[PDB]
Amino acid sequence: KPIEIIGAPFSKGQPRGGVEKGPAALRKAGLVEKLKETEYNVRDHGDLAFVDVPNDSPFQIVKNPRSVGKANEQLAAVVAETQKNGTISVVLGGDHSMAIGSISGHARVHPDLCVIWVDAHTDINTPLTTSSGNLCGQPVAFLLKELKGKFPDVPGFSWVTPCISAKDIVYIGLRDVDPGEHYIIKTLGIKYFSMTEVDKLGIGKVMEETFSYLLGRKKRPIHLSFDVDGLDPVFTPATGTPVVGGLSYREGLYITEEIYKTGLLSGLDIMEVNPTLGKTPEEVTRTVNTAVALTLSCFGTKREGNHKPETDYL
Amino acid sequence: KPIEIIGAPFSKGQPRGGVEKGPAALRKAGLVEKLKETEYNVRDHGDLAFVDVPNDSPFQIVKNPRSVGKANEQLAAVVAETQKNGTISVVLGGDHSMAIGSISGHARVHPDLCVIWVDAHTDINTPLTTSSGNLCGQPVAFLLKELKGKFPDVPGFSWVTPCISAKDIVYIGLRDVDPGEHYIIKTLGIKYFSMTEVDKLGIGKVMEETFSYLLGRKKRPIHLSFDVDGLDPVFTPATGTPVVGGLSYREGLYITEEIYKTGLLSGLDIMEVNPTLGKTPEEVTRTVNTAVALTLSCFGTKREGNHKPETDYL
Amino acid sequence: KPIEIIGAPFSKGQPRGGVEKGPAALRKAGLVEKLKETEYNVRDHGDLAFVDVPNDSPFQIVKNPRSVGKANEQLAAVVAETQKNGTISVVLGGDHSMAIGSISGHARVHPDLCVIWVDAHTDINTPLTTSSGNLCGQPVAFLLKELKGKFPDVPGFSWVTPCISAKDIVYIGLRDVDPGEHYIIKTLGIKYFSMTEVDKLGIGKVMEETFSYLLGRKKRPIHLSFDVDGLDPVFTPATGTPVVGGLSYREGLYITEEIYKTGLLSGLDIMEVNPTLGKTPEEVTRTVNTAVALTLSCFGTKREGNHKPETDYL
Numbered sequence A, B, C: 001k002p003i004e005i006i007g008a009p010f011s012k013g014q015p016r017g018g019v020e021k022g023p024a025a026l027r028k029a030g031l032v033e034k035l036k037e038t039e040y041n042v043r044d045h046g047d048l049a050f051v052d053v054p055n056d057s058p059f060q061i062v063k064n065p066r067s068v069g070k071a072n073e074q075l076a077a078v079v080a081e082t083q084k085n086g087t088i089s090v091v092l093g094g095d096h097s098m099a100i101g102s103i104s105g106h107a108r109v110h111p112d113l114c115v116i117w118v119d120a121h122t123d124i125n126t127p128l129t130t131s132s133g134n135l136c137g138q139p140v141a142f143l144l145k146e147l148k149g150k151f152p153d154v155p156g157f158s159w160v161t162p163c164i165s166a167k168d169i170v171y172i173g174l175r176d177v178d179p180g181e182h183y184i185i186k187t188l189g190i191k192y193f194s195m196t197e198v199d200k201l202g203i204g205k206v207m208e209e210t211f212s213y214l215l216g217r218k219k220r221p222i223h224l225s226f227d228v229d230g231l232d233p234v235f236t237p238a239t240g241t242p243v244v245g246g247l248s249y250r251e252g253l254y255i256t257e258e259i260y261k262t263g264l265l266s267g268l269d270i271m272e273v274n275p276t277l278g279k280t281p282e283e284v285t286r287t288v289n290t291a292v293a294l295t296l297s298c299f300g301t302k303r304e305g306n307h308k309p310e311t312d313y314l
């Protein structure tokens, strides 16, 4: 199945800039070229051009609502189209608010999809529970059916239609959840494996349970939304909201290796790589290389190694 | 149940100074204020003032015996009193010799208590087996009933009465045990999970077994004596005796989260944070923040998040 | 059973120099003296003197073939002799090409031996599959019976006779395997636990399975060939080919503790410690100390502690 890379250089979902440079940094490291060495056919859609909405005043506490809503409507259209042609979409972020468009467009073609969200955060604050008003911490709230009508309609998002139920998403890596968010995930009965569960079970058991929960009853497309801050700051330091005690480099690759093995990956997001936030050049290189490795892992690259079929190396 | 913070700025149990500054460093980081945000009622007893015993000559190889014995007698009295009023005592060290007074005072009110000792060391050397004579490496020897009469009475400790049996203590994190200490824990049949057992079982299984061993037969108060060097030097570098290959930050919090969940925590010690031993200011900040996080974890703070009851955040 | 330390200061198996200084660095850290504190009788054979073969032109792509082949023939002779006298050989590298001589000499006395290869690499490239021509990445190819006749006879190695079968070796730590190597290990059905398997199973289960696979049917001598780059660069940075996401310090010691417990260790290699590759003096000290700890672990040193028999420490 073909792969289509879609750059989403957008940072309006955040208070500070820099994450819009993520796609460029990833390409600079040769992500596209490296992906072409895998078993998949790769196509680069390029980077989307986003139109900044003039006089985009705050909707209550929410910041840049129209700009964020517009960027996501455009991304959703692009993703829906690539999905329609039967190709796996790979969105390079960009802040996590872009998951609204990515998942929305994906669901237009595969409404029965499930979501595996790797992040130190739930990103499920609503316009009413958010303390910052930053849309990068509210993606999931705009996507969940059970949250529909629980907050006022935000300018620029009227095109959004809640596509997934609280039962179709699984969080992995949680360790920085706001009171309101914790109330929401507990009240909605959302399935999650915070770092506490990862420590208890081991990443091996976490993936077994994640798959039995989401796929045990029926096999459906998987949308993996990977926020780089899900891994410990020691591995991915160049990111907006680093939180200590995260997933290790090994655990991140294990997650992606297992997702690859399911043969169900249909959509992927590689978010929050902010090249301007490295304390040193090396911290940026470290973060970019990790994001690249995770992406290649999603598409076949295994740590035990790989070799071409019908080729007698000896 | 109320919480009472007791500072024990004492370093005579060690050859070098600096650890007496631990309580100050912990408070500076806002430990007290942060604890007040938990579900517990918090009271700060302040820092105990210790009277240095004049001409405190060495008892054989043992150093500062009278000063250490006197400081611990005072701490035991203070702890016994807070325990008597039904409050959970939290001792901020200070070197680990202060566990003598902390546990002794605790046992005066809850004689059926059990001890979970998180440390890279057993701290079970007796005045006869010690190679250094430092009392910070001998706490447990003064507390165990089975060791009573196995060493000469040390000046300043005649007030001490062995309160716990070798069967009421569980070590977690061991990786730097002297020959004599190893002989003692094996000969006394003390239950332990050295790093070898943690690697084999995983911290999840270690806590299950620790609880079944200490609480399976009967539920009793838990005294958690946490030496910061139990965690790997990468997490808590500013400490007197760092040892490579320790518990991770995640594992330390898992331990404390599980202890919180038992609902049996009755006494706590946060020891060996020495602010003068950081190779850089950041290593000190790293160590203090970790100690603070572990303390908050013992009192309810969970990585999956927390929220106030009877509060509709939506 | 006696122990005999054999230094192999050789670096011709690699493109760059420096690893020949490994034995010196290890001794400088007091490896020999520390080993004498264990339960084993220790003898130091000293460092072998290798004769550089003049005009050692490349055999096709292979570099320094005659020099590498000659050094290994000499090492094999020395190892065979120590093995003959019933002593455990401990080879200090030196680049991993020296495993050819170490294992070859070992097999002359214990032809039924098995090999546990801890490395981030398989080092199984043949003179035809190698992209570099460096012999440090081809040791196993010269040792495997199934690879006999799969590549042209290399000058300087005519003395070598494939001694082990693909079924007598187990890899642990793999995470950087070339396409050709992956083709070879899959085609030959070699047993391995790449980092993916370690993440899935946990090091505890990995060792159980390694032993059931190699020893379940019959107990035989164990040859442990330990490449320091098997551990993550955070623990052993001063090495030629560091690869992120490796075994932890704890896991490395667990491996060695378990091998010690089998009572079957017959030959040991401590390879790839290159003192010239530390980014700082401390990174070198860190690498050397780790190699020393692993070696002592192989001979009895346990993290739970150790004490002398027939000695009443109390």
Ligand SMILES: NCCC[C@H](N)C(=O)O
Pocket: A121, A123, A125, A130, A131, A132, A133, A134, A136, A137, A138, A176, A177, A178, A241
């Ligand atoms: N991704 C960071 C999220 C932080 C906080 N939950 C917020 O909603 O602002």
Ligand SMILES: NCCC[C@H](N)C(=O)O
Pocket: B121, B123, B125, B130, B131, B132, B133, B134, B136, B137, B138, B176, B177, B178, B241
């Ligand atoms: N806490 C460090 C202890 C070191 C050694 N066991 C001693 O008793 O001096």
Ligand SMILES: NCCC[C@H](N)C(=O)O
Pocket: C121, C123, C125, C130, C131, C132, C133, C134, C136, C137, C138, C176, C177, C178, C241
């Ligand atoms: N030990 C490093 C090996 C790297 C590569 N497999 C090679 O054969 O050159």
Ligand SMILES: [Mn+2]
Pocket: A119, A120, A121, A227, A229, A230, A241
């Ligand atoms: Mn996040």
Ligand SMILES: [Mn+2]
Pocket: A096, A119, A121, A123, A136, A227
């Ligand atoms: Mn996120």
Ligand SMILES: [Mn+2]
Pocket: B119, B120, B121, B227, B229, B230, B241
């Ligand atoms: Mn200690």
Ligand SMILES: [Mn+2]
Pocket: B096, B119, B121, B123, B136, B227
């Ligand atoms: Mn201690």
Ligand SMILES: [Mn+2]
Pocket: C119, C120, C121, C227, C229, C230, C241
């Ligand atoms: Mn290697």
Ligand SMILES: [Mn+2]
Pocket: C096, C119, C121, C123, C136, C227
């Ligand atoms: Mn090697």
